[PDB]
Amino acid sequence: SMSVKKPKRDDSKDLALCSMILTEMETHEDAWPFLLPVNLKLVPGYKKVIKKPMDFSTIREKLSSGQYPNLETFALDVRLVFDNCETFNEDDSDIGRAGHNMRKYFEKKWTDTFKV
Ligand SMILES: CCOC(=O)c1cn(C)c(=O)cc1Cl
Incomplete structure (x- = not known):
């Protein structure tokens, strides 16, 4: 609260680490x-069903133009991609399974990178 400062993690490397993680997403064979x-x-159906569309190129553009205030807003948009995927696609589908694979792939990198 006011004048009660809380210990803060070092966030100076966050932009660079998120960019690295996004690059690994972009080059995954299931990223298509x-x-x-x-x-x-x-x-x-997509436009009516999916209220907030999101994809890696849009995330890349936002990251490159300072539109993420913090790393958590970055993670929200990434997860939004796989949440939209689950809403629109059967698990048994190629896109559906690709989504599940990419989500798992993201979350391990997120933990390994920032859950220090
Ligand atoms: C390159 C193919 O991409 C699509 O057309 C597509 C991608 N996602 C993530 C969907 O949920 C639905 C389609 Cl049609």
């Missing part, structure tokens, strides 16, 4: 359904 925004003109 998530590299670009879903085409709202070709994909039936």
